[PDB]
Amino acid sequence: DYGEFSKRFSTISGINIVPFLEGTREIDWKGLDDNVEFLLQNGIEVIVPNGNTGEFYALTIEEAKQVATRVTELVNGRATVVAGIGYSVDTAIELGKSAIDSGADCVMIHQPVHPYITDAGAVEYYRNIIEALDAPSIIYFKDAHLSDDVIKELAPLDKLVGIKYAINDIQRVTQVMRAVPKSSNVAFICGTAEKWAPFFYHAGAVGFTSGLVNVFPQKSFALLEALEEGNQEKIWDVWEDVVPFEDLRAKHNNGNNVVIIKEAMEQLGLRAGVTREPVNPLSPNDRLELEELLKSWNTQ
Amino acid sequence: LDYGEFSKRFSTISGINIVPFLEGTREIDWKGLDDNVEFLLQNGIEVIVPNGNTGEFYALTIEEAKQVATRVTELVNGRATVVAGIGYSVDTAIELGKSAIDSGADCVMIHQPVHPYITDAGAVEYYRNIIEALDAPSIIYFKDAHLSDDVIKELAPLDKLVGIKYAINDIQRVTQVMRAVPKSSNVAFICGTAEKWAPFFYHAGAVGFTSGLVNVFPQKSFALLEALEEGNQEKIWDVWEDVVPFEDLRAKHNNGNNVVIIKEAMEQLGLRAGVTREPVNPLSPNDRLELEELLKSWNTQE
Asked: How many domains does chain A have?
């Protein structure tokens, strides 16, 4: 079951958005349903509700639970659903149990928000949450200050079926990947999307997360196909074609990450609404750059 | 209530208490907490901050956080100014805020947003909607160097914003923002990076500083405050050199040692502190030895 479960991540892990109505900023449930359908219709096999692309941290615990339940029931098993969870140990467990009870297949443990953390404490935190949940777990690993030994010590756990490695250190990625036995049934996914997928794949990654799929999933799948085949020239061509989008999202220390996707969607006639605080709409200059890039893509 | 006078309350040490936990269940040790609060008050603390990071705010459920704020506020019972820490989503921050204030807290402190994505304009909206929704003043813990100091400048005019715990160790920036905000805005600038940075922030214009050391050796922290207020440079530097070793230990491992250093230190001194909750475990053997030696030195000095 587990070893086979980890296999499901050798593809694109799409992180859906959570449309919010302009004005009140309340969740736009119809828009949410439409985004989920959009993803499934375009080939997405793994959907990640309550990921950062869905502005998880801008939701109350009650809202988070409702989003995971809604996305899970809409998917109705047409894809693997990974529910994001976080916060204190008991709160993460509360969220996980809620998602699993709603039918979610797996949970993704967000980077702890705690300002203070150690390797040893990290292992306890992760172990305690994973063991308390009756479903597989995936860890989003992005704190370069933590040792990869944390992963090596946890990897053996049957419930730990994947790591969305998000530290863009190609040396470390290759190292941890080579140190974890295949018997640990741990899927290593590039947690930094399309811009880094090619490099993580060369090192051994079997999949990658994506926010681009909410707007141009065909470009994202074009990369997955080029990667799975081995067409180096195609890989680089597609890579070079989408990096501009990922670089825009990274502006202002990633402050533009979701707002770039929502405004792009709204320009293409897709229902996305706006982002919640602490992110406002794009600056005029940033909006101009986005329109420019979209104008280009239309050309191609 | 005149906000101008309220902001003056922060021209002192803002003590951030700990939240001791029990044996292996890790449940809150209410007795230990009451005693830590008493310890701080008996040693002169005029401003106490429940649900600060020194109190492992993020390791607490929402329910536990409200209980801690409530507990501290009632125990203090007006003996000091209480600033309740709040965070998370806008509605959750307001929820935590209303709860602490209803319990009697005098002010709230907005933690750095946990959101991985934030912009200057969105930050302004985040902060303003929370302050405006609370029936008490707010202070902002500003530590993201990627955000512009103009966020602070934009919000300063708000009557309810009575202070900024500036935690970006960029002395050029701290000097600039403080000269930019007019006194009429009644915003107290507090050094949010404690004793190691207090002297430099003070020379720049800060009027107070946060501290975690006060949970163990408050007399040293207060020796530094007095020296700073008197302008005795020699004493300032002497006390500074004396406590820096403690703050440096706390900062190891990208600040992973921050709270565990304080709790192990308290225990070594026979104070009720317990162990830290996940994701922080006990000190590494070597750091434990370093701490023990520092305490030995401090004993010898006395």
From this structure: 1
